[PDB]
Every structure is written in structure tokens, then in C-alpha cells.
Write a protein that binds this ligand. Structure first.
Ligand code: 9NS
Ligand code: 9NS
Ligand code: CL
Ligand code: CL
Lengths: 149, 149
């Protein structure tokens, strides 16, 4: 549980927003990329795993599951690369709702930045700090620290 | 001190590596940028503060301290922007040794990536996972979780 992440790709403004969600906490990281290539996904995972103890990644689609560049990054960073099949149907709904929430936040901040990438990072900030009462940022640190101890 | 970070800028291959160091743990995040502008620094801080509870940042130089774009990011993200004067002379030596370590790691991985940005992210990974026994990644989570609790 502490090491499980899910990839998620959503679109806005003719660009791609790549998201990684820490499943147990709902904490996220995200980036804007021109398109979702194996190379972009691989680089994103490399960044993520240098920052958090990523044990397992559920890939967002079959192309990223198949990609030898993505597999190479998972090999490099010591990540178990897994599919993203929603054996629990609740997963679909959670990701859908998260994408809707994120796009809402991006709209609320969109005029505070020229570039979409800035707006996305503002949305990451708001999402991770929002008290649901703990925030996702508090939950991920608590979950991981408890695991360490 | 769970919320204190230090900016650090170093150069390699005619490019700039911008680093943020969590002072109490030695955990780092870093990026490769063409040059160290206020906009680049502002965006980097926005990213960092969406990911960790950044209370205070000691800027790496007077230009980033002065920059109204950097001040705007610090205002947006609720970060106290401070100078980076090494009132404790040990700070100087710690950052210099860190830059030397990072450059050493980048050399050890340099042939595993075409692009410097990849090698830098590999170096971040190795640095944060290295047991010195706990790793910097373990220490930052423990420090912050203890603070929350
Ligand atoms: C598929 C070719 C790419 N190479 C293959 C390569 C070339 C030369 C030597 C070793 C390798 C190798 O396979 N290394 C092991 C490995 C793969 C992933 C992690 O470790 C690795 C790579 C991936 C993503 C990137 C990269 C680079 C890079 O070569 O630097 O560059 C930045 C780019 C940014 C995002 C974007 O622009 O899409 O993402
Ligand atoms: C000084 C001009 C910068 N703008 C001013 C602006 C333009 C329009 C509306 C509001 C603002 C405003 O002041 N907003 C509050 C604020 C400032 C910093 C954080 O919040 C904000 C900005 C900064 C860094 C970036 C940006 C952008 C952007 O406009 O999107 O774009 C990506 C870029 C990438 C790194 C690189 O390429 O250097 O870093
Ligand atoms: Cl946070
Ligand atoms: Cl780590």
C-alpha cells in the first residue's frame, strides 16, 4: 500500500496532463507534455521514483504497459510495472472524479498564469493541500513514515 | 526546521542544474534549465511547494532574492522567501560537497542517457536513496511526519 501508484492521463487545451496518484492517500504529481509517448512517461516515472518510494506503478494504458522505454525506466528505478485494469470498479470512478476536480481547479487558476503548465502546478498544490481533516500531502507522509517505522 | 529548504545552482555541460535541498534531511529535488532566470526559479518553487510543505526557502543568490517573479511564486505558494547568507559557515561547505557528490553521480550514470536532464534525475534518485543507517528520503518523511504528529 505505501508504495502503490497509479498513472492517469487527461487532456486539456490540446495538451496532455500526465498524473501519478498515490493510491492510499490521493496525493498527486503531474506534468503537462505535448503528447503521451513512452519516453515522456519513462522520464516522468524516473522523476517520481527519485522523490517518493515507488514500489509499484499501475500504468494508465496498454501502450505504456507495453513500451520498452517505460519498462526500462521501471527497471532502472526499481519499480514493479503493472497493468491498470480496474478489478475494483471503484477505481474508474475515483480517477474520473479526480480528473474532473483537477480540471475545475485549473479553471479557477487559469487566468493567474500565461502557460497551462503553471496552472497545472497550481492545481497540484491546491489538490495536495486541501483538507478533506487531513490533506493528501499529510496522508502520504504519515502512510510512508508508519511503513518506515 | 521540517519546512526549511535551500536553493542551490550549479553548472554542467553548459547548462544549469537548479537544486532544492531540504536542510534537516539532505533530501533533494533538481532540474536542468538553460539558464537561471526568475521565471525558471519561480516555476521550480511552485512545483516543490505543491509536493512538500515548504515553509521557508533560502534563495541561492541575490538575483533570485530580488526577483519579483520569484517573490510572486513565494507569495502564491505561501513560502517565506529568505536570503541564503551562510551565517553558519558550515552551510557553504555542505552545499559545495553536495554539488561535488551530485556531479560525481552524474558522471557515473552519464552514459545511461542521451540527455543531461535524465542523468540528473538518475542522480537525484541515487542521492535520495543512498543509506548513510537511513536515506535522505527516509529522513525527510520521518521529520515531516513527526511534525504533523
Ligand atoms: C528511448 C530512448 C531514450 N533513452 C534511451 C537511452 C539512450 C542512451 C543511453 C541509454 C538509454 C537508456 O535506455 N537508458 C536507461 C533508461 C531508460 C529510461 C530510464 O533509464 C533514455 C531516455 C528516456 C527518457 C528520456 C530521455 C532519455 C535519454 O536518453 O536521456 O531523455 C529525456 C526525455 C525527456 C522526456 C521527453 O522529452 O520525452 O526522457
Ligand atoms: C513574470 C512572468 C511569469 N508569469 C506572470 C503571470 C502572467 C499572467 C498571469 C499571471 C502571472 C503571475 O504573475 N502569476 C502569479 C505567479 C507568478 C509565479 C507564480 O505565480 C507567471 C509564470 C511564472 C513562471 C512560469 C510561468 C508563468 C506563466 O505565466 O505561466 O510559465 C511557465 C514558466 C516555465 C519556466 C520557464 O519557462 O522559465 O514559469
Ligand atoms: Cl503538501
Ligand atoms: Cl526515495
Amino acid at each position: 500500500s505505501p508504495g502503490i501508484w497509479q498513472l492517469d492521463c487527461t487532456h486539456l487545451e490540446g495538451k496532455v496532463i500526465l498524473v501519478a496518484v498515490h493510491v492510499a492517500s490521493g496525493y498527486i504529481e503531474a506534468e503537462v507534455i505535448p503528447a503521451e509517448t513512452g519516453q515522456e512517461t519513462a522520464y516522468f516515472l524516473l522523476k517520481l521514483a527519485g522523490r517518493w518510494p515507488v514500489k509499484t506503478v499501475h500504468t494508465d494504458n496498454g501502450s505504456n504497459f507495453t513500451s520498452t522505454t517505460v519498462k526500462a525506466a521501471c527497471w532502472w528505478a526499481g519499480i514493479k510495472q503493472e497493468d491498470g485494469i480496474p478489478y475494483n470498479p471503484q477505481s474508474q470512478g475515483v480517477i474520473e472524479s479526480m480528473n474532473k476536480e483537477l480540471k475545475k481547479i485549473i479553471g479557477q487558476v487559469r487566468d493567474q498564469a500565461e502557460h497551462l503548465k503553471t496552472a497545472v502546478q497550481m492545481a497540484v498544490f491546491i489538490h495536495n493541500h486541501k483538507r478533506k481533516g487531513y490533506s493528501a500531502g499529510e496522508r502520504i507522509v504519515d502512510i510512508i513514515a508508519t511503513d518506515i517505522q
